[PDB]
Amino acid sequence: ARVKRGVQANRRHKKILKRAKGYYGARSRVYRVAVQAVTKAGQYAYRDRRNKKRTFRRLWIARINAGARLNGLSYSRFINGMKKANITIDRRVLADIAMHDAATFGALVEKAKAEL
Amino acid sequence: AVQKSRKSRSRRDMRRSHHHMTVAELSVDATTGEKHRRHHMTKDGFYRGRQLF
């Protein structure tokens, strides 16, 4: 009962070469290089799934700092004033408001400054 | 003496980019009205209205 590996090997290798589409050079053409690039790509995706939350929190904090300083206050005091006012708005929503609605963020800064 | 890592196809093509075929200039003799290379006599042998043979 002999088994030939041709068909299964072909399909196994096509899966990897399909996941390796768009890569440079040997990485998208030959299996020995493509398979490493796909595994390394998965590793990068796994790590950046952690890192993306930090990056976006970073961006929200930067935008909130910019808005607070336009309204006459720093980020470390504006967040403290939020926490003393018992305002639960997250940094994502705060950055959205700062970026797309200046007057509402001004009102928020007024509440924070009244609480400070 | 030898490569440490095989040259890529793009790198190989970049060297080839400069190589180009030469295209000869073309003029027509008034007397015979035939295509011929610039400053070179015609197939028939009529050059600047003169008989070589």
């Binding site: - | 190589h19 075929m21 295209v23 000869a24 073309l26 290379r37």
Partner: protein, 109 residues
């Protein structure tokens, strides 16, 4: 509309014939024939020969006016390689690739 001539099996490397092909690609048949007949490369005889075959095809089998024809597209492909042995010093042998090429020319308005 595209009339084709094929010159499978030229005794010359495709890499050499491609330099000739690049200069006649897209030109009118008159200019291409002039370039090929005043070219100093061996690939030029094969390319002119295939272009003439294509022009004859377009004029005889399809009744086209060769005055308005053009080299619509041309490319050279690698043919079958003849494998030969080259003796070297100290009793060592090397393989020799005597490469061939296939020339495809399509002419049309």
């Amino acid at each position: 509309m595209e009339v084709t001539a094929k010159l499978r099996g030229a005794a010359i490397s495709a890499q050499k014939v491609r330099l000739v092909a690049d200069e006649v690609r897209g030109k009118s048949i008159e200019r291409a024939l002039d370039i090929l007949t005043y070219s100093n490369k061996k690939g030029a005889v094969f390319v002119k020969k295939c272009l003439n075959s294509a022009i004859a095809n377009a004029e005889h089998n399809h009744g086209l006016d060769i005055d308005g024809l053009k080299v619509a597209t041309i490319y050279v492909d690698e043919g079958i390689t003849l494998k030969r042995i080259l003796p070297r010093a100290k009793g060592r042998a090397d393989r020799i690739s005597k490469r061939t090429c296939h020339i495809t020319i399509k002419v049309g308005e």
